[PDB]
Amino acid sequence: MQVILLDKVANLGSLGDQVNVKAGYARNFLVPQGKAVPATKKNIEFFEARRAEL
Template identity: 65%
Template sequence: MQIILMEKISNLGQLGDVVNVKSGFARNYLIPQGKAKRATEQAIAEFQSRRAELEKKQTEILAAAQIVAAKLDGLLVQITQKAGSDGKLFGSVTNANIAEALTGLGFSVERTMIHMPHGQLKQVGDYPLSISLHGDVKASITVSVLGDSAF
């Protein structure tokens, strides 16, 4: 199915590109989320008339993401979990826990933005993580998992 991209999508294309994708991907994800429209003549004409407006909106989103990334870069987030004497956590620290901690600090971060290369954190310690705020903007934070004695 041919679609017009209404925003930049990683590994797919830029704003305004006409690309060919699988029908299910377009119908179930891209079109309902407003990330794309079917590539009909009417939709292409409508897009051309709104192109400047959409580009301005994308530029504003990118600028906002860069501001948040500047504030987040190098941030140390401390999370306390119950742990045994050997430093092993009872349970684990997930990206949802980290997103909740960042929200508590005043940042609007969703759990899907947090990239945890080694999976859930199961030991006490410091872990460098990256947060993808936008397709082109990433921030690096350090999560410090502190053990709370279970006694």
């Protein structure tokens, strides 16, 4: 779903963009194995500050 990436994962990733992917690829691979974070409307404002400040 609306998950935001953090890693060099293959061609849907650009070090973090909101994509439209299925929920099966969301959980257990992106929801924690690393490499991403769920977007439960709290991380879309927290990691947005990580984009601007860094």
